[PDB]
Symmetry: C3
Subunit: 162 residues, 3 copies
């Protein structure tokens, strides 16, 4: 599986990107003094700092969207890697998703004008959709009747008693 | 692993179901004009459309619940597939989860009367619980003392010097 | 892969811990009468019980944080298990993460003083960071030029025509 080290490379960089979003979220909490729990708020000034902030909420939205997209990629991309796809095609799938998700986070936390973020979401979802369809294709043909699968390989049953 | 193509089939259909929930979420945002970000709201009418909506929140809750349930299934079901279970039993696990989760989303976005949704949640969780216990069983017996594992296979140590 | 049954053991216990958080969340909803959906609220007293509660929100935050941390562990830990690491070192990674995450949930739902929870988060993230770096290391060296990889193995090219 020559696509596997490519997948492990892109997938792990994405998980690390998610860890970075988490770190950013914490730092925004500190600087804005907006904590989710009263116990946190006491340690950093007092009870009034148990409150929401637009930037914290934005960070949480970016993190959630990552979870809604990157996690299924971790699954789909892994399985797809064992379907023996064209190595260059596989790279393209992984790279489009990686560039797209990084761009998504930049457009989100950077508050770029609409619909830039929405576009990056859709573009990144394209290779995921492709991998899902390809996996479904391979799983489905497993359950095709043996006679049909034989015919698709140019083999019809023989009436010759041999 | 004859259960594997069954698993890949159900698991991928579930990921696609999650993508559909995402799409529905976006469409509800458009129609209700309820955006999470001010930049989105400007592009689609103005700042007043940066607001929440009960349907958007409902969609987000359905998506989160999917994430809380389908993602561990992707993990448990995969590992379970390599434990060589009875193929029919494996199918049943995958199918109960698939039917249950689809039903869960229908009951959620369709606002059916309580406790229909809650019931579908519990029913779908049953095969997950079963797979988790079975995996734990197999992992645990790996760490059993060699003498005990031998005895469970009908082999006691021999005092005969051979 | 001697680390694998160790991983499957810790990982599955963590998924079960997440299921328990879900169960706790439901019970807190019942006792506090704080439901997210109006249909649920009707079944359990009436429309006024469609409301938020600090404990429910806290439970949801704990569950989300689990999702932000345990899910990438399920991925990283699995891949790491096939990198043939030292069995004792692998155990340590899995055990630090398991103890840390359990401690995180206890500190969260138990409302312990800050920064206890935040500390357990960081400690648990340490083995994840280590596994991610190690995976990246192995993936990266796959794409090193063949000549460099040979040299790192003590093999320079030979000018002798043999
Ligand atoms: C006051 N405090 C906080 N406060 C806090 C609270 Cl109460 C709530 C929310 C945040 C924001 N979180 C963040 O910024 C993260 C880096 C944890 C993601 C923070 Cl930073 N987090 C800490 C985190 C740590 C921490 O993780 N230290 C490193 C260790 F865990 F390995 F010990 C810490 O250790 C200091 C010392 C002396 C114990 O080493 C202190 C900490
Ligand atoms: C105005 N707009 C939006 N608006 C928007 C905003 Cl600002 C915020 C929230 C939503 C709701 N999201 C959705 O409905 C999704 C389908 C993206 C899930 C939407 Cl639809 N999303 C777009 C998304 C796209 C889009 O993804 N186009 C296809 C492409 F990405 F491949 F180019 C787009 O492309 C139009 C054009 C001319 C650039 O092709 C325009 C778009
Ligand atoms: C009234 N009710 C609710 N209410 C409810 C509602 Cl409407 C909203 C939120 C919660 C909190 N959820 C929880 O506590 C969970 C255990 C589901 C996580 C609950 Cl408990 N959930 C049920 C859940 C079930 C349930 O899951 N029963 C077991 C079965 F599904 F296998 F049938 C149920 O079955 C009773 C009967 C007679 C149908 O067996 C009734 C239920
Ligand atoms: N949970 C998403 C579902 C649709 C989606 O993923 N939309 C993309 C493109 S508009 C996005 O960036 N959503 C922002 C978000 O999830 O906060 C939402 O509420 O919008
Ligand atoms: N996060 C869940 C934990 C319990 C759970 O999963 N409940 C099921 C059956 S009541 C459900 O459908 N919850 C709706 C949801 O998560 O919005 C919650 O807040 O209720
Ligand atoms: N989503 C997290 C990102 C940072 C994080 O994971 N922080 C740890 C240590 S402070 C935590 O326990 N956060 C609580 C939470 O996610 O509710 C947040 O909003 O704080």
């Amino acid at each position: 599986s020559p696509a596997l080290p490519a997948f492990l490379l892109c997938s792990t960089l994405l998980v690390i990107k998610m860890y970075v979003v988490a770190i950013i979220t914490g730092q925004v909490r500190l600087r804005k003094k907006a904590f989710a729990n009263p116990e946190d708020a006491l340690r950093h000034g007092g009870p009034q700092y148990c409150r929401s902030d637009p930037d914290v909420e934005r960070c949480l939205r970016a993190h959630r969207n990552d979870m809604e997209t990157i996690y299924p990629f971790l699954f789909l991309g892994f399985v797809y890697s064992f379907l023996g796809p064209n190595p260059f095609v596989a790279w393209m799938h992984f790279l489009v998703f990686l560039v797209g998700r990084v761009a998504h986070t930049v457009a989100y936390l950077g508050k770029l004008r609409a619909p830039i973020r929405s576009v990056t979401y859709t573009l990144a979802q394209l290779p995921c959709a492709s991998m899902a369809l390809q996996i479904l294709w391979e799983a489905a043909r497993h359950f095709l009747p043996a006679a049909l699968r034989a015919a698709l390989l140019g083999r019809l049953r023989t009436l010759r008693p041999w």
